[PDB]
């Protein structure tokens, strides 16, 4: 699985290693992915990069990060999903001190067609 | 909905902010979508890191427009996206002071299993 | 490095795994990534998703696809990026037989600090 993580900039790196664990633990409990093919990207957004509700968070725009990509193979259930999805969700918020309620999850469901790894497709390794 | 915005670096924090807002109002006029649902990623890219044809500007190619991804829930009509994709298009045209011919916007759709807002599932609420 | 290439739907599956295998390659030639490093997921776009001049091309928009989203561990060079620019181009254009001025790519870089393999940062594992 691999997880794009947008959030606000300014965090050290310990809370980032400690975000990186924590939400792989979450992707392992939840869909059973082998812990070494969890890969978690993050990626930082200055104030002035962050919009919610047409203002940005530079002008006072209320929490609307994290937003996680989580790219998966094809073949998880919907209740997996919807535990993938409550995971990431407590995980981040928690680790970053963030709203719940503003983290979202969005699962990109990768046809095993679709999918490469090493140069070779997830259905020629039987995935 | 969700829109990130593939930008190259070199516009100040007026231009930004203008983007977000009237990006914002494009995607409410014309999906309906509550304004304060709307979510505007800026990923501010060096030229360097931008590819047209093949290459960089910085190695010839012409300016980039940005290049809208719009995350949307899964149940927007055909309209609706035909509508959206025309007013992110004018509207970046608009702020950026650039050809609309080259304004670009794709849409994912993320099905309702797949997509999740607090911790819940879209499905799980009523969406 | 992780790779989304967004594309028309409707190619074959013998089109989409020699896609994978020759971007693959094209990533290994450019940067010298360990090529089992090298994900590459492929995001298939309706017709009426995919927009340029803010028409689909359901509607008559000109080629506009492959767009390739390249995600890759800070520290790669100018002169490495062109390549992969280049490579990543000229590649997907020539196995979908699309033209390369419809070509994009998008390269972000991600600080070791910001990336996770298996729980932990690519700076804990010496890289």
Same mark, same amino acid.
């Given at each position: 699985?691999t ?24 992707? !392992? ?10 890969? !978690? ?6 104030? &002035? ?21 989580a790219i998966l ?6 209740? %997996? ?9 407590? &995980? ?8 719940? %309620?503003?983290?979202? !999850?969005?699962?990109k469901?990768i046809?095993? &067609? ?5 140069? %070779? &497709? ?6």
């Amino acid at each position: 699985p691999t997880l794009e993580v947008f959030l606000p900039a300014g965090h050290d790196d310990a809370r980032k290693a400690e975000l990186i664990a924590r939400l792989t633990g979450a992707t !392992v409990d939840s869909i059973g992915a082998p812990i070494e093919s969890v890969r !978690v990207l993050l990626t930082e957004l200055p104030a &002035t990069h962050i919009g919610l509700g047409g203002r940005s968070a530079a002008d006072g725009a209320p929490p609307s990060l994290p937003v996680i990509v989580a790219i998966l193979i094809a073949g998880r259930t919907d209740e %997996q999903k919807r535990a993938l999805i409550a995971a990431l969700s407590e &995980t981040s918020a928690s680790v970053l001190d963030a709203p719940l %309620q503003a983290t979202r !999850v969005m699962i990109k469901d990768i046809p095993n &067609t679709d999918f490469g790894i090493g140069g %070779q &497709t997830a259905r020629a390794l039987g995935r």
